[PDB]
Amino acid sequence: ELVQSGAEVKKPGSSVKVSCKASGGTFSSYGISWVRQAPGQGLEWMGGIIPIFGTANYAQKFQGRVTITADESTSTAYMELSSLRSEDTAVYYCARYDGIYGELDFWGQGTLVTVSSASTKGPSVFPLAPSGTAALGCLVKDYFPEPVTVSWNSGALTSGVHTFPAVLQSSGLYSLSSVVTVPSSSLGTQTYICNVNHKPSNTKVDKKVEP
């Protein structure tokens, strides 16, 4: 596994520094690459590092705008991109490759970087109340930036769960609903909680959904 840092907002002109933490410590033999993905766009390679040497290649596009480093002690690598403009909003993935090959055999979970001159807001969570199957859910309204994770019963319920893509409202805040279909019969007995986490604002909220 490769563990990446949480998503962030940065204001235009500044610089971001994303962390990628390796498995166990045996990232000795292996390289680490940074590939980014702009929304609805392809995969774009920014650069690689072979950690035991602290040696970095970069794409021509990201010349001396990007700097990639490894931390030999606690086995983490970093991509630092500067002079962030609107175009740099993207998910930043780190991935591991073998120096004698080059396939990216393992990837980090992704790090969303929203380049915006707009402040971080945590969301409000409202219940979507129950109507032989019944829909119930949670509205997750007015947050910034993306993303927000939504789980049901701490992970006990995954079946029939649709969590929608966020919309950007005319206010410039994101909103999203997460719904679930369950048996009608279980309503007045099985209790249902939605577990919302907006990491950019340290907001964990758990909300019970009753009719």
Binding site: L43, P165, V179
Partner: protein, 214 residues
């Protein structure tokens, strides 16, 4: 430097059918420093094939690849609903330069499915704050095309609903959809009957779900 060209941009096929995706290189990447990745919605790319033809651990047998020089292919021999994804080729002949193809979007065709429709009234908690969101859910339908129209009392409302569609279900290839009508508390309290009317080819006549403000 090396430009990878993927073709076609979109492949729309049913389960069982064969998906063959092409990837062309601007110069030779040899006995293949060429790899394929699968990217399912909301997820990191996953390695499928490397060295043009080598299958990675855990990747199902129905995936294979071939090619050399500048012409390559990835084949999903018998497509499965779980194969909904964007697929990317990647060349790595010189380790100082990794490039990727623009991806091919594999979409899964299926039989027509009717949306189960639900309507949600605003929470009291949201109303105390001075906004009313009304949520209409169209669940597990196919194809994408749907018409959601809001009816307040019985006049057609416009201009203050947003839609969002989920991506095709990995398991049954259906879409779900939410229409959210957002009004001020004052605007909300102007009317009584809030109705969602769904037109889809899975239904003989448009279904309507409604509640009376209470």
């Amino acid at each position: 430097e090396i430009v990878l060209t993927q073709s076609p941009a979109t492949l729309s096929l049913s389960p069982g059918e064969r998906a063959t995706l092409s990837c062309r290189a601007s110069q030779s990447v040899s006995d293949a420093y060429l790899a394929w990745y699968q990217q399912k919605p909301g997820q990191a790319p996953r390695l499928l094939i490397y060295d043009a033809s080598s299958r990675a651990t855990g990747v199902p047998a129905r995936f294979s690849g071939s090619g050399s020089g500048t012409d390559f292919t990835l084949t999903i021999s018998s497509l499965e609903p779980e194969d909904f994804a964007v697929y990317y080729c990647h060349q790595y002949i010189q380790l100082h330069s990794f490039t990727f193809g623009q991806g091919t979007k594999v979409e899964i065709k299926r039989t027509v499915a009717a949306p189960s429709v639900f309507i949600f009234p605003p929470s009291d908690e949201q109303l105390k704050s001075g906004t009313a969101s009304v949520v209409c859910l169209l669940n597990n339908f196919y194809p994408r095309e749907a018409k959601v129209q809001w009816k307040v009392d019985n006049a057609l409302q416009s201009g203050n609903s947003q839609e969002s569609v989920t991506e095709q279900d990995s398991k049954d290839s259906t879409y779900s959809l939410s229409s959210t009508l957002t009004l001020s508390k004052a605007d909300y309290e102007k009317h009584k009957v809030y109705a969602c009317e769904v037109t889809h080819q899975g239904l003989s006549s448009p279904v309507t779900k409604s509640f009376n403000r209470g």
